[PDB]
Amino acid sequence: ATLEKLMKAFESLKSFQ
Amino acid sequence: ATLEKLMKAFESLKSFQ
Amino acid sequence: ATLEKLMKAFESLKSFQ
Amino acid sequence: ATLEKLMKAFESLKSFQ
């Protein structure tokens, strides 16, 4: 699902930050 | 700013999707 | 699911903006 | 700024969750 992908991306970004 | 970076990342992700 | 709720909230915010 | 508002909304949602 596109929503799932978006969520994953956001999480990754947060972790990086 | 961290907020700005986050926003940019989100936008990029959206575009990709 | 919490993820779904978050997504919905984000969408609503975007629409409002 | 619209970006700032969006960020604030997201934070609030996260806190609620």
Side-chain angles (χ1 to χ4, degrees):
Chain A
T2 60
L3 291 169
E4 181 178 0
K5 181 179 177 63
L6 178 61
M7 279 284 100
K8 180 172 70 65
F10 183 82
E11 290 300 311
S12 64
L13 291 168
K14 279 284 184 72
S15 295
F16 279 22
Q17 201 280 329
Chain B
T2 60
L3 291 169
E4 181 178 0
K5 181 179 177 63
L6 178 61
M7 279 284 100
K8 180 172 70 65
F10 183 82
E11 290 300 311
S12 63
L13 291 168
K14 279 284 184 72
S15 64
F16 294 136
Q17 201 280 329
Chain C
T2 60
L3 291 169
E4 181 178 0
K5 184 177 180 62
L6 178 61
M7 279 284 100
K8 180 172 70 65
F10 183 82
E11 290 300 311
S12 294
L13 291 168
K14 279 284 184 72
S15 64
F16 178 79
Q17 201 280 329
Chain D
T2 60
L3 291 169
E4 181 178 0
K5 181 178 177 62
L6 178 61
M7 279 284 100
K8 180 172 70 65
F10 183 82
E11 290 300 311
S12 180
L13 291 168
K14 279 284 184 72
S15 294
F16 176 80
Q17 201 280 329

